[PDB]
Ligand binder design. Structure first.
Ligand SMILES: OC[C@H]1O[C@H](O[C@H]2[C@H](O)[C@@H](O)[C@@H](O)O[C@@H]2CO)[C@H](O)[C@@H](O)[C@@H]1O
Ligand code: ZN
Length: 366
Protein backbone atom coordinates (compact mmCIF):
# COMPACT_ATOMS: atom_id res chain seq x y z
CA UNK A 1 0.00 0.00 0.00
CA UNK A 2 0.82 3.70 -0.10
CA UNK A 3 3.48 4.64 2.47
CA UNK A 4 2.46 7.41 4.84
CA UNK A 5 4.64 10.31 5.92
CA UNK A 6 6.12 10.47 2.45
CA UNK A 7 5.18 11.50 -1.08
CA UNK A 8 5.63 9.51 -4.28
CA UNK A 9 5.00 11.36 -7.52
CA UNK A 10 4.60 10.03 -11.06
CA UNK A 11 5.27 12.26 -14.04
CA UNK A 12 6.01 11.30 -17.67
CA UNK A 13 9.57 10.71 -18.89
CA UNK A 14 9.52 13.66 -21.29
CA UNK A 15 8.80 16.20 -18.53
CA UNK A 16 11.18 18.02 -16.21
CA UNK A 17 11.18 15.44 -13.43
CA UNK A 18 14.38 16.92 -12.07
CA UNK A 19 12.96 20.41 -11.91
CA UNK A 20 10.20 18.65 -9.98
CA UNK A 21 12.49 16.53 -7.79
CA UNK A 22 14.10 19.89 -6.95
CA UNK A 23 10.82 21.43 -5.83
CA UNK A 24 10.55 18.34 -3.69
CA UNK A 25 13.90 19.04 -2.07
CA UNK A 26 12.67 22.38 -0.79
CA UNK A 27 9.47 20.77 0.49
CA UNK A 28 11.53 18.16 2.30
CA UNK A 29 13.85 20.78 3.80
CA UNK A 30 10.74 22.67 4.91
CA UNK A 31 8.81 19.69 6.27
CA UNK A 32 11.18 16.77 6.70
CA UNK A 33 8.77 15.02 4.34
CA UNK A 34 10.75 13.18 1.66
CA UNK A 35 9.44 13.51 -1.92
CA UNK A 36 10.21 10.78 -4.48
CA UNK A 37 9.73 11.50 -8.20
CA UNK A 38 9.38 8.62 -10.70
CA UNK A 39 8.57 8.37 -14.41
CA UNK A 40 7.57 4.76 -15.06
CA UNK A 41 6.68 3.71 -18.60
CA UNK A 42 3.01 3.76 -19.61
CA UNK A 43 2.21 5.44 -16.30
CA UNK A 44 -1.11 6.71 -17.71
CA UNK A 45 -2.10 3.02 -17.97
CA UNK A 46 -0.23 1.78 -14.91
CA UNK A 47 -1.76 4.36 -12.56
CA UNK A 48 -5.39 3.17 -13.05
CA UNK A 49 -4.15 -0.41 -12.74
CA UNK A 50 -2.57 -0.01 -9.28
CA UNK A 51 -4.75 2.79 -7.95
CA UNK A 52 -7.72 0.43 -8.44
CA UNK A 53 -6.33 -1.80 -5.69
CA UNK A 54 -5.45 1.16 -3.48
CA UNK A 55 -1.80 1.33 -4.54
CA UNK A 56 0.24 3.65 -6.72
CA UNK A 57 1.75 7.13 -6.21
CA UNK A 58 0.20 9.86 -4.02
CA UNK A 59 0.37 12.29 -6.91
CA UNK A 60 0.06 11.52 -10.60
CA UNK A 61 0.83 13.93 -13.44
CA UNK A 62 -0.58 13.67 -16.95
CA UNK A 63 -2.50 15.64 -19.55
CA UNK A 64 -6.05 16.23 -18.28
CA UNK A 65 -7.70 13.93 -20.82
CA UNK A 66 -7.01 10.79 -18.78
CA UNK A 67 -8.38 12.14 -15.48
CA UNK A 68 -12.10 11.87 -16.19
CA UNK A 69 -11.60 8.13 -16.46
CA UNK A 70 -9.66 8.10 -13.18
CA UNK A 71 -12.26 10.20 -11.33
CA UNK A 72 -15.03 7.99 -12.69
CA UNK A 73 -13.27 4.92 -11.30
CA UNK A 74 -13.06 6.70 -7.94
CA UNK A 75 -9.25 6.80 -8.09
CA UNK A 76 -8.87 10.54 -7.47
CA UNK A 77 -9.45 12.51 -4.29
CA UNK A 78 -11.34 15.78 -4.60
CA UNK A 79 -9.01 18.74 -4.29
CA UNK A 80 -9.76 21.62 -1.92
CA UNK A 81 -8.28 24.90 -3.20
CA UNK A 82 -9.42 28.27 -1.76
CA UNK A 83 -11.67 30.31 -4.04
CA UNK A 84 -8.70 32.61 -3.69
CA UNK A 85 -6.26 29.94 -4.83
CA UNK A 86 -8.36 29.01 -7.85
CA UNK A 87 -8.47 32.70 -8.77
CA UNK A 88 -4.77 32.49 -9.66
CA UNK A 89 -5.54 30.25 -12.65
CA UNK A 90 -7.51 30.90 -15.83
CA UNK A 91 -11.16 29.73 -15.69
CA UNK A 92 -10.50 27.55 -18.78
CA UNK A 93 -7.69 25.68 -17.03
CA UNK A 94 -10.01 24.71 -14.16
CA UNK A 95 -12.78 23.62 -16.52
CA UNK A 96 -10.27 21.15 -17.95
CA UNK A 97 -9.82 19.38 -14.60
CA UNK A 98 -13.52 19.53 -13.66
CA UNK A 99 -15.51 16.28 -13.81
CA UNK A 100 -19.13 15.89 -12.70
CA UNK A 101 -19.02 19.09 -10.68
CA UNK A 102 -15.76 18.33 -8.90
CA UNK A 103 -12.27 19.63 -9.40
CA UNK A 104 -10.28 16.38 -9.58
CA UNK A 105 -6.81 17.78 -10.24
CA UNK A 106 -4.51 20.81 -10.13
CA UNK A 107 -3.93 22.47 -13.55
CA UNK A 108 -0.25 23.00 -14.34
CA UNK A 109 0.42 23.88 -17.97
CA UNK A 110 -1.28 24.16 -21.36
CA UNK A 111 0.33 22.00 -24.06
CA UNK A 112 0.00 22.24 -27.82
CA UNK A 113 2.23 20.94 -30.58
CA UNK A 114 4.10 23.40 -32.78
CA UNK A 115 6.24 23.21 -35.90
CA UNK A 116 9.89 23.29 -34.86
CA UNK A 117 12.37 24.04 -37.65
CA UNK A 118 16.08 24.52 -38.26
CA UNK A 119 16.62 28.20 -39.11
CA UNK A 120 19.93 27.59 -40.87
CA UNK A 121 18.43 24.89 -43.11
CA UNK A 122 15.05 26.62 -43.47
CA UNK A 123 15.01 30.37 -42.82
CA UNK A 124 11.35 30.29 -43.84
CA UNK A 125 9.36 27.18 -42.79
CA UNK A 126 6.54 26.03 -45.11
CA UNK A 127 3.02 27.30 -44.52
CA UNK A 128 1.24 24.27 -45.96
CA UNK A 129 1.57 20.50 -45.66
CA UNK A 130 1.22 20.27 -49.44
CA UNK A 131 4.54 22.00 -50.18
CA UNK A 132 6.52 19.75 -47.84
CA UNK A 133 7.05 16.91 -50.36
CA UNK A 134 8.75 19.25 -52.85
CA UNK A 135 10.80 20.77 -50.04
CA UNK A 136 12.01 17.30 -49.08
CA UNK A 137 13.22 16.79 -52.64
CA UNK A 138 15.12 20.07 -52.75
CA UNK A 139 16.64 19.48 -49.30
CA UNK A 140 18.41 16.44 -50.79
CA UNK A 141 20.98 18.86 -52.25
CA UNK A 142 22.03 19.55 -48.66
CA UNK A 143 21.86 15.92 -47.60
CA UNK A 144 18.74 16.52 -45.51
CA UNK A 145 15.09 15.46 -45.16
CA UNK A 146 12.24 17.94 -44.73
CA UNK A 147 10.34 16.55 -41.76
CA UNK A 148 10.50 13.92 -39.06
CA UNK A 149 8.21 13.42 -36.09
CA UNK A 150 6.70 10.70 -33.92
CA UNK A 151 4.35 8.55 -36.01
CA UNK A 152 3.76 5.96 -33.28
CA UNK A 153 1.67 8.21 -30.99
CA UNK A 154 -1.62 9.52 -32.46
CA UNK A 155 -1.21 12.72 -30.44
CA UNK A 156 1.33 13.82 -33.09
CA UNK A 157 -0.57 12.91 -36.26
CA UNK A 158 -3.98 14.06 -35.00
CA UNK A 159 -3.39 17.75 -35.87
CA UNK A 160 -3.29 16.76 -39.55
CA UNK A 161 -6.17 14.28 -39.28
CA UNK A 162 -8.42 16.93 -37.69
CA UNK A 163 -7.33 19.68 -40.10
CA UNK A 164 -9.83 18.83 -42.85
CA UNK A 165 -12.65 17.81 -40.49
CA UNK A 166 -11.66 14.80 -38.41
CA UNK A 167 -12.67 14.90 -34.75
CA UNK A 168 -13.06 12.73 -31.69
CA UNK A 169 -16.15 13.39 -29.59
CA UNK A 170 -17.67 16.63 -30.90
CA UNK A 171 -16.95 19.05 -28.03
CA UNK A 172 -17.34 16.18 -25.59
CA UNK A 173 -20.46 14.57 -27.08
CA UNK A 174 -19.83 10.81 -27.07
CA UNK A 175 -22.69 10.21 -29.52
CA UNK A 176 -20.84 12.24 -32.16
CA UNK A 177 -17.61 10.56 -33.30
CA UNK A 178 -15.75 11.83 -36.36
CA UNK A 179 -12.58 9.74 -36.66
CA UNK A 180 -13.75 8.10 -39.86
CA UNK A 181 -15.29 11.00 -41.80
CA UNK A 182 -13.96 12.68 -44.97
CA UNK A 183 -11.67 15.15 -43.23
CA UNK A 184 -10.02 12.38 -41.22
CA UNK A 185 -9.56 10.26 -44.33
CA UNK A 186 -8.03 13.18 -46.21
CA UNK A 187 -5.55 13.94 -43.44
CA UNK A 188 -4.39 10.37 -42.86
CA UNK A 189 -4.19 9.76 -46.59
CA UNK A 190 -1.81 12.68 -46.94
CA UNK A 191 0.41 11.17 -44.27
CA UNK A 192 0.33 7.71 -45.86
CA UNK A 193 1.15 9.24 -49.25
CA UNK A 194 4.15 10.95 -47.68
CA UNK A 195 5.29 7.49 -46.58
CA UNK A 196 4.53 5.67 -49.84
CA UNK A 197 6.48 8.34 -51.74
CA UNK A 198 9.44 7.93 -49.37
CA UNK A 199 9.25 11.38 -47.79
CA UNK A 200 8.90 9.84 -44.31
CA UNK A 201 9.27 6.41 -42.68
CA UNK A 202 6.36 4.71 -40.90
CA UNK A 203 8.74 3.47 -38.21
CA UNK A 204 9.80 6.94 -37.03
CA UNK A 205 9.15 7.36 -33.32
CA UNK A 206 9.87 9.99 -30.67
CA UNK A 207 13.55 9.06 -30.22
CA UNK A 208 14.40 8.84 -33.92
CA UNK A 209 12.67 12.13 -34.72
CA UNK A 210 14.31 13.99 -31.82
CA UNK A 211 17.78 12.70 -32.74
CA UNK A 212 17.25 13.37 -36.44
CA UNK A 213 16.26 16.98 -35.78
CA UNK A 214 18.64 17.73 -32.93
CA UNK A 215 21.53 16.19 -34.90
CA UNK A 216 20.56 18.62 -37.67
CA UNK A 217 19.73 15.90 -40.20
CA UNK A 218 16.10 16.99 -40.68
CA UNK A 219 14.90 20.56 -41.25
CA UNK A 220 11.70 20.15 -39.22
CA UNK A 221 9.98 18.18 -36.51
CA UNK A 222 6.71 18.41 -34.56
CA UNK A 223 6.75 18.50 -30.77
CA UNK A 224 5.68 20.22 -27.55
CA UNK A 225 7.46 22.68 -25.15
CA UNK A 226 9.16 19.83 -23.26
CA UNK A 227 11.35 19.18 -26.32
CA UNK A 228 12.96 22.65 -26.45
CA UNK A 229 15.59 22.24 -23.71
CA UNK A 230 17.14 19.27 -25.54
CA UNK A 231 17.27 21.29 -28.75
CA UNK A 232 18.90 24.11 -26.75
CA UNK A 233 21.63 21.66 -25.81
CA UNK A 234 22.09 20.56 -29.44
CA UNK A 235 22.90 24.18 -30.29
CA UNK A 236 20.66 23.92 -33.35
CA UNK A 237 19.46 27.38 -34.37
CA UNK A 238 15.75 26.57 -34.17
CA UNK A 239 12.46 28.40 -34.26
CA UNK A 240 8.95 27.51 -33.11
CA UNK A 241 6.04 28.39 -35.34
CA UNK A 242 2.52 27.60 -36.49
CA UNK A 243 1.81 24.13 -37.84
CA UNK A 244 1.36 23.79 -41.60
CA UNK A 245 -2.13 23.98 -43.10
CA UNK A 246 -3.85 21.11 -44.91
CA UNK A 247 -6.29 21.79 -47.73
CA UNK A 248 -6.12 25.42 -46.64
CA UNK A 249 -7.25 24.54 -43.13
CA UNK A 250 -4.93 24.92 -40.10
CA UNK A 251 -3.70 21.84 -38.25
CA UNK A 252 -5.72 21.30 -35.09
CA UNK A 253 -3.66 19.81 -32.27
CA UNK A 254 -5.52 18.29 -29.35
CA UNK A 255 -4.67 20.60 -26.46
CA UNK A 256 -3.79 19.07 -23.13
CA UNK A 257 -3.50 20.54 -19.67
CA UNK A 258 -0.71 18.87 -17.77
CA UNK A 259 -2.36 18.21 -14.41
CA UNK A 260 -1.55 16.76 -11.01
CA UNK A 261 -4.07 14.49 -9.32
CA UNK A 262 -4.07 13.05 -5.80
CA UNK A 263 -4.57 9.31 -5.28
CA UNK A 264 -7.88 8.66 -3.46
CA UNK A 265 -6.12 5.94 -1.45
CA UNK A 266 -3.31 8.23 -0.33
CA UNK A 267 -2.96 8.67 3.45
CA UNK A 268 -0.85 11.75 2.64
CA UNK A 269 -3.47 13.92 0.97
CA UNK A 270 -2.64 16.77 3.34
CA UNK A 271 1.05 16.73 2.45
CA UNK A 272 0.12 16.50 -1.25
CA UNK A 273 -2.16 19.51 -1.17
CA UNK A 274 0.59 21.50 0.55
CA UNK A 275 3.27 20.46 -1.92
CA UNK A 276 1.16 21.26 -4.96
CA UNK A 277 -0.34 24.57 -3.87
CA UNK A 278 2.52 26.16 -1.92
CA UNK A 279 5.52 24.56 -3.60
CA UNK A 280 4.64 23.84 -7.23
CA UNK A 281 1.77 26.11 -8.26
CA UNK A 282 3.69 29.25 -7.40
CA UNK A 283 5.64 31.49 -9.74
CA UNK A 284 8.89 29.87 -8.56
CA UNK A 285 7.75 26.25 -8.37
CA UNK A 286 6.86 26.21 -12.05
CA UNK A 287 10.13 27.96 -12.90
CA UNK A 288 12.17 25.19 -11.27
CA UNK A 289 10.50 22.62 -13.52
CA UNK A 290 10.27 24.90 -16.57
CA UNK A 291 14.06 25.24 -16.47
CA UNK A 292 14.45 21.47 -16.53
CA UNK A 293 11.95 20.91 -19.32
CA UNK A 294 9.72 23.71 -20.63
CA UNK A 295 6.07 23.45 -19.53
CA UNK A 296 4.61 25.82 -22.10
CA UNK A 297 1.78 28.22 -21.25
CA UNK A 298 1.36 27.68 -17.50
CA UNK A 299 -1.99 27.76 -15.70
CA UNK A 300 -0.78 30.28 -13.13
CA UNK A 301 -2.09 33.72 -14.24
CA UNK A 302 0.94 35.48 -12.78
CA UNK A 303 3.54 33.40 -14.58
CA UNK A 304 1.80 33.05 -17.94
CA UNK A 305 1.47 36.82 -18.23
CA UNK A 306 5.23 36.88 -17.67
CA UNK A 307 5.92 34.28 -20.36
CA UNK A 308 3.70 34.39 -23.45
CA UNK A 309 6.13 37.16 -24.42
CA UNK A 310 8.50 34.34 -25.32
CA UNK A 311 8.42 33.67 -29.09
CA UNK A 312 8.11 29.91 -28.61
CA UNK A 313 5.40 30.26 -25.96
CA UNK A 314 3.44 32.65 -28.19
CA UNK A 315 3.62 30.11 -31.02
CA UNK A 316 2.49 27.37 -28.63
CA UNK A 317 -0.51 29.54 -27.77
CA UNK A 318 -1.20 30.25 -31.42
CA UNK A 319 -1.38 26.56 -32.31
CA UNK A 320 -3.43 25.84 -29.18
CA UNK A 321 -6.04 28.34 -30.40
CA UNK A 322 -6.35 26.66 -33.78
CA UNK A 323 -6.70 23.27 -32.12
CA UNK A 324 -9.00 22.09 -29.33
CA UNK A 325 -8.86 21.27 -25.63
CA UNK A 326 -9.24 17.53 -25.05
CA UNK A 327 -12.30 15.93 -23.65
CA UNK A 328 -11.72 14.45 -20.23
CA UNK A 329 -14.47 11.88 -20.45
CA UNK A 330 -13.67 8.17 -19.70
CA UNK A 331 -14.12 7.34 -23.37
CA UNK A 332 -10.92 9.19 -24.33
CA UNK A 333 -8.74 6.14 -23.63
CA UNK A 334 -10.67 4.03 -26.18
CA UNK A 335 -10.46 6.87 -28.69
CA UNK A 336 -6.64 7.07 -28.43
CA UNK A 337 -6.16 3.30 -28.52
CA UNK A 338 -8.30 3.12 -31.67
CA UNK A 339 -6.63 5.98 -33.53
CA UNK A 340 -3.19 4.77 -32.43
CA UNK A 341 -3.86 1.41 -34.01
CA UNK A 342 -5.39 2.95 -37.14
CA UNK A 343 -2.49 5.33 -37.80
CA UNK A 344 0.12 2.59 -37.37
CA UNK A 345 -1.89 0.14 -39.52
CA UNK A 346 -2.48 2.67 -42.32
CA UNK A 347 1.08 3.95 -42.21
CA UNK A 348 2.62 0.45 -42.22
CA UNK A 349 0.40 -0.83 -45.01
CA UNK A 350 -1.32 -3.40 -42.79
CA UNK A 351 -4.56 -1.66 -43.75
CA UNK A 352 -5.79 0.98 -46.16
CA UNK A 353 -6.71 4.38 -44.73
CA UNK A 354 -10.43 3.60 -45.16
CA UNK A 355 -10.22 0.24 -43.41
CA UNK A 356 -8.05 1.60 -40.61
CA UNK A 357 -10.34 4.49 -39.67
CA UNK A 358 -13.42 2.29 -40.12
CA UNK A 359 -12.05 -0.18 -37.55
CA UNK A 360 -11.07 2.75 -35.33
CA UNK A 361 -14.66 4.01 -35.52
CA UNK A 362 -15.85 0.53 -34.57
CA UNK A 363 -13.46 0.14 -31.63
CA UNK A 364 -14.82 3.42 -30.33
CA UNK A 365 -18.58 3.06 -30.81
CA UNK A 366 -19.17 -0.70 -30.80
O1 LIG B 1 -0.82 9.72 -28.51
C1 LIG B 1 -1.93 9.53 -27.66
C2 LIG B 1 -1.74 10.22 -26.32
O2 LIG B 1 -1.74 11.65 -26.56
C3 LIG B 1 -1.57 12.45 -25.39
O3 LIG B 1 -0.34 12.20 -24.74
C4 LIG B 1 0.69 13.20 -24.92
C5 LIG B 1 0.78 14.06 -23.66
O4 LIG B 1 -0.43 14.79 -23.49
C6 LIG B 1 1.94 15.06 -23.77
O5 LIG B 1 2.12 15.66 -22.49
C7 LIG B 1 3.26 14.39 -24.22
O6 LIG B 1 3.78 13.63 -23.18
O7 LIG B 1 3.07 13.53 -25.36
C8 LIG B 1 2.04 12.52 -25.18
C9 LIG B 1 2.02 11.69 -26.46
O8 LIG B 1 2.98 10.64 -26.42
C10 LIG B 1 -2.73 12.18 -24.42
O9 LIG B 1 -2.60 12.99 -23.25
C11 LIG B 1 -2.72 10.70 -24.05
O10 LIG B 1 -3.80 10.42 -23.16
C12 LIG B 1 -2.84 9.85 -25.32
O11 LIG B 1 -2.73 8.47 -25.00
ZN1 ZN C 1 6.68 13.54 -53.53
Amino acid sequence: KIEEGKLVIWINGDKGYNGLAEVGKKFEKDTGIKVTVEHPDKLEEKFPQVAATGDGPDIIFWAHDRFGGYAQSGLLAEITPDKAFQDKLYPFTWDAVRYNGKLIAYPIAVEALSLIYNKDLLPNPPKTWEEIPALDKELKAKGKSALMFNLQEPYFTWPLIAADGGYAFKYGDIKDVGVDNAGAKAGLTFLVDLIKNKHMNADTDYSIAEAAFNKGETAMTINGPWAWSNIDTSKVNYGVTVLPTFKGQPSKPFVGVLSAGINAASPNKELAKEFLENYLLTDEGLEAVNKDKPLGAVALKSYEEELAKDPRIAATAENAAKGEIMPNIPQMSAFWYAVRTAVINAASGRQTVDEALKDAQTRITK
